[PDB]
Design an enzyme around this catalytic site. Structure first.
Site, PDB file in Angstrom:
ATOM      1  N   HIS A   1     -63.570 -32.736  72.560  1.00 50.15           N
ATOM      2  CA  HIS A   1     -63.156 -31.741  71.416  1.00 50.15           C
ATOM      3  C   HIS A   1     -64.527 -31.440  70.853  1.00 50.15           C
ATOM      4  O   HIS A   1     -65.367 -32.198  70.828  1.00 50.15           O
ATOM      5  CB  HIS A   1     -62.305 -32.088  70.416  1.00 50.15           C
ATOM      6  CG  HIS A   1     -60.688 -32.041  70.857  1.00 50.15           C
ATOM      7  ND1 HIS A   1     -60.068 -30.935  71.399  1.00 50.15           N
ATOM      8  CD2 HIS A   1     -59.722 -32.969  71.028  1.00 50.15           C
ATOM      9  CE1 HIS A   1     -58.919 -31.257  71.480  1.00 50.15           C
ATOM     10  NE2 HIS A   1     -58.647 -32.480  71.246  1.00 50.15           N
TER      11      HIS A   1
ATOM     12  N   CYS B   1     -65.507 -26.883  72.497  1.00 50.13           N
ATOM     13  CA  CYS B   1     -65.321 -25.772  71.485  1.00 50.13           C
ATOM     14  C   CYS B   1     -66.507 -25.878  70.729  1.00 50.13           C
ATOM     15  O   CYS B   1     -67.137 -26.958  70.353  1.00 50.13           O
ATOM     16  CB  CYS B   1     -63.946 -25.814  70.893  1.00 50.13           C
ATOM     17  SG  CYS B   1     -62.593 -25.258  71.449  1.00 50.13           S
TER      18      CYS B   1
END
Lengths: 170, 88, 88, 170
Positions: A110, A158
Site C-alpha cells: 500500500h 498508490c
C-alpha cells in the site's frame, strides 16, 4: 523453451548481442562467475489497512522473471518501515554485489504520497518508507559494491487517493 | 591514492503511477503494473534497453479505462544503456 | 461525448544535479549543465530522441573533478520517443 | 550554416527522418502552420542571496537554442515564486499551444532541496517554487492544450549544499 533457466523471457541471440554492441552500454560480467542479486519486499498482511489480495501472484511473477534474467532473488514479506530499512541495509552489505554487474529492487505494498506503507501503518501512526531512503541506502556511499552498476527500483503502490484522470470532449 | 566518485549514479526507478494517483491491483490476477512489466520484460529484454522497456509499459497504459494509471520513471542517473542480454 | 485522459502524461524533467547536491556555474562562461546541454542538443537533436540526449549529457559528467555534478532525469511520463527533427 | 534559422544545431536530413520513421514517436505538426512556444524563467538579481554572475550567458544560449529548434521564446527575469506561478499560469493559457506539438520550460536560479528560489528568498522567509507545482500547472487538467504533447522541463539549480561526491581508493 520455458523448461530452461530463462523461462518465458525471450532469449537474446549472439547475432543480436553484436548488433547492439558501443561504449554507451553497461558492461555485463561473465555468466560463469557472476553473482547477481535481487530483492523483493512485499507487504500483504497489514494491521490497520485492508489485505492486499493477489500479492502472491505478483511475488511469483517478479521472482521468476528476475531469476530468468539471472538474479538470485531474496523475498521478504510483511515488514515495517524500520524492518525494510534494516533489510535494505543488509542487502547493500551483501558480498555478492562485488561480483555482480547490477541489481533489482522490488517494492510492493500500500502507498501514499509520502511513500510506501509498512505493515503497522495507519493514519494515526504513520509507518512510511520514503523513496529517498531507498536511494540513499543503495548509493555509492552506503553501497560502494554497486558503484558504476545499474540499480533498478520497481515500486507497486498508490501515490495518493486520486483516480489520475481528467475529462475531455471529443 | 583516492579518487572522487558521484554519490548518486546509475539509478532508475519505475513507479506504478504518477504522484497523487492510485495504482490498481486485481484480487486474483495481481497488480496491473506488475503483470504488464513482466509481459514487456519477457518480450523486449532481448532487444531493448531497460529505459525503452519502461517507456513501452507506459505506452500500453495510454488509453484510460474505468481503472486508469500512468507508470512513471523517476530519478534517473543511468549514464549508459542497460541491456539485460537474456541468455548471456 | 466525454472521454477520460491521464492527468499527468508526456512530461520529462532534466535537473542540473542529483537531490541534496550542488550545481556549478562559471561566472563568465555560464552554467556547466546549461552549456553542456546546448552542446549535446546542437550535436544530437538530428539523430537522437530527447531522452537519449539527456543520457549523453549525464555520461559527459561521469568523471568527477574538483567541481562535480550529476544531472538527473525526473518524473518521466513520455509514452513515445520525442525527436526534435531540426530543419523540419 | 550558422546564418540560417537553425543556427549551430545540426540539421536532420530527409533521409535521416525516414530512417527514424514508427508508431512510437511523437507527431510533429506542419512547419508552415505550427506555433511552438517556450518559456525561460531566469533569476539573476536577488534580495538576500548573492548575484548569479554568468546567467546572461545561459539566457543567450538557451534562448537561441530553443529558437533554432523552432520555438518562440518568452524570457522572464527576476521573479518571486508567486510571480513564477502567475507566469506559468499565463503560459499554460496561451492559445498557440493548441497549434503546437510540444513545449520547453527552462528554470534557472538558486536552489535548495525543496525547490527553486525566487528573488525574495532568504533562510528567514523562504520563497520557493516546487517542481510539483510546475508539473501541476502544465498537466492535462490545468493545460488541456498540451494534452498528448511532450513537455520538457529544464532546471539549472542546486538541490542542496552537498558536493555530491564520495571517496574511493583505486
Amino acid at each position: 523453451t520455458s523448461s530452461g533457466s530463462e523461462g518465458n523471457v525471450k532469449l537474446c541471440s549472439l547475432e543480436e548481442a553484436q548488433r547492439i554492441w558501443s561504449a554507451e552500454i553497461y558492461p555485463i560480467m561473465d555468466k560463469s562467475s557472476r553473482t547477481r542479486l535481487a530483492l523483493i519486499i512485499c507487504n500483504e498482511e497489514f494491521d490497520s489497512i485492508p489485505r492486499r489480495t493477489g500479492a502472491e501472484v505478483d511475488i511469483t511473477g517478479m521472482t521468476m522473471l528476475l531469476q530468468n534474467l539471472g538474479y538470485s532473488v531474496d523475498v521478504k514479506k510483511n515488514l515495517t518501515a524500520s524492518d525494510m530499512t534494516t533489510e535494505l541495509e543488509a542487502f547493500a552489505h551483501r558480498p555478492e554485489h562485488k561480483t555482480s554487474d547490477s541489481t533489482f529492487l522490488v517494492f510492493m505494498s500500500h502507498g501514499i504520497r509520502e511513500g510506501i506503507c509498512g505493515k503497522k501503518h495507519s493514519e494515526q501512526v504513520p509507518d512510511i518508507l520514503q523513496l529517498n531512503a531507498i536511494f540513499n541506502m543503495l548509493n555509492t556511499k552506503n553501497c560502494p559494491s554497486l558503484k558504476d552498476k545499474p540499480k533498478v527500483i520497481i515500486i507497486q503502490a498508490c501515490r495518493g487517493d486520486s483516480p489520475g484522470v481528467v475529462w475531455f470532449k471529443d | 591514492a583516492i579518487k572522487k566518485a558521484h554519490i548518486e549514479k546509475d539509478f532508475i526507478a519505475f513507479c506504478s503511477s504518477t504522484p497523487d494517483n492510485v495504482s490498481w491491483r486485481h484480487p486474483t490476477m495481481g497488480s496491473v503494473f506488475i503483470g504488464r512489466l513482466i509481459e514487456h520484460m519477457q518480450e523486449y529484454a532481448c532487444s531493448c534497453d531497460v529505459e525503452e522497456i519502461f517507456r513501452k509499459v507506459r505506452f500500453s497504459f495510454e488509453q484510460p479505462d474505468g481503472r486508469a494509471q500512468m507508470p512513471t520513471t523517476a530519478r534517473v542517473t543511468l549514464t549508459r544503456c542497460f541491456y539485460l542480454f537474456p541468455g548471456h
